Amino acid sequence: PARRPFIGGNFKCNGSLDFIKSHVAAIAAHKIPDSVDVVIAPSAVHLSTAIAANTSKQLRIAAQNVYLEGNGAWTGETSVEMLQDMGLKHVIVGHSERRRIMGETDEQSAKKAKRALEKGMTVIFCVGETLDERKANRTMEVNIAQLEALGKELGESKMLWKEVVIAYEPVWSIGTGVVATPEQAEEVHVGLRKWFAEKVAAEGAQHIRIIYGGSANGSNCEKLGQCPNIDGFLVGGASLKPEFMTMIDILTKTRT
Amino acid sequence: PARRPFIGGNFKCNGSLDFIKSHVAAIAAHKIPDSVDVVIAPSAVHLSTAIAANTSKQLRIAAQNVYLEGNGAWTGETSVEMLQDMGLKHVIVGHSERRRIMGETDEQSAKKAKRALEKGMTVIFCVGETLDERKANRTMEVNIAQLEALGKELGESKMLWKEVVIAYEPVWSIGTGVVATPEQAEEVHVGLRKWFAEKVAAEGAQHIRIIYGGSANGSNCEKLGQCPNIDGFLVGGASLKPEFMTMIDILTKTRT
Ligand SMILES: [Ca+2]
Ligand SMILES: [Ca+2]
């Protein structure tokens, strides 16, 4: 029931070539212990540049999205095969900006994840409810439906769950500066542990990482990290700034 | 009423790092006259690699898609600003694989194009009808609705049309090996010229390029290129092969 802490930084649709070289170099220059997983996710056109600038043996690079077919006639998309050819092993799937703004459905998110996992990738799988859904008292029902879809696609092959990191990001917390309270986030995380224990495996539930995202930063992260079911963070805006490195330091001290 | 010929090659969701280096080098080694525009569009994660391998002063590199906002919280997307920072000036908008498979609407295609054009980019703007629509005798109505949307977004600023290249690709011809006959394609192109003359400008209609796509290759392209309203080609599968270079040679001889 001892879990390795995880922190991811999602650059989103931001960055120039020079900023990527500079900021990746600054993170890579920081001490990153071997006892914590640290991942950053640049925009797709910047992945090659980030890889070249990454001089750290610990720092990993992730893609922000992937398509759910292999190589073929899919103009504008990126395949799992392309990422692995570049040497990448991490990918974000189902981010709310894609679920709620660009119409990506529960099942499509689940199918993207399944294919990446079967190929041997680590998937940061995102779930979260909107303000309306929370007001209608549907928080846990929404979050569990999103996960259930993945369970459906995965099947009785529960071994693929081993490379899933679940990221809970309430939609009303994304980019708004309104971070959830420790009480709000821990409640949802506890909910998800119990679902995982019931629907997948009790021993598995003890080992899978569940991270919190949505306005997480260097000021508010320490208190959150003390919640027992919060294994780390998926960081948006702050991952573009010097305080990402400070978050790495605090995560290490809190949970290792 | 003399128009500069244009050929584009869309790699789609294909390629490895090594294949991109190798194939871009092979195209770049070919003689490309200054009297024809030649553009290739690698997948987004390969753009940097293609740029580095491109030793030609004539060859241009395009992106396969772009989003319709500037830099911000848009996980998985690419901005016009990112492309220009990389030194790119061409982008494909509204490819049918995105209209018909991934739900990209007429107006969204139009808004993507408008933003790219306002920033100074050249847009290869794709239109085309499905087999069902052609059977219901709606070919011209479909194609013109798709373009009208762009006219709507553009406005009384008809000067932005100067950097548009229209690509007609019947959907039933895309990736199927069923190329349209010269008669079928020329008919549609004539239709589009007349719309452009009526809704935009008679002098403009004399200068805008309209290219044909859909199973175009080195065997069937010469006859097509002799149609007066077909100014060149948007090439899919064949752009990944050695015959792309042969198509460049024939286009030059036919239309310059
Ligand atoms: Ca995030
Ligand atoms: Ca094409």
UniProtKB/Swiss-Prot annotation, chains A, B:
This chain belongs to the protein called Triosephosphate isomerase
Active-site residues annotated for this sequence: H95 (electrophile), E169 (proton acceptor)
Q: An example of a Gene Ontology BP annotation on this entry?
A: glycerol catabolic process
* Protein origin, superkingdom: Eukaryota
Transmembrane region positions? Answer: none
State the GO CC annotations: cytosol
Task: List the CDD domains.
Answer: TIM
According to UniProt, the reaction catalysed is: D-glyceraldehyde 3-phosphate = dihydroxyacetone phosphate; dihydroxyacetone phosphate = methylglyoxal + phosphate
**Pathway given in the UniProt record:** Carbohydrate biosynthesis; gluconeogenesis; Carbohydrate degradation; glycolysis; D-glyceraldehyde 3-phosphate from glycerone phosphate: step 1/1
Task: Provide the assembly information.
Answer: Homodimer.
> Organism classification, top ranks?
Eukaryota, Metamonada, Diplomonadida, Hexamitidae, Giardiinae
Concerning InterPro entries, the annotation shows: Aldolase_TIM, TIM_sf, TrioseP_Isoase_bac/euk, Triosephosphate_isomerase, Triosephosphate_isomerase_AS
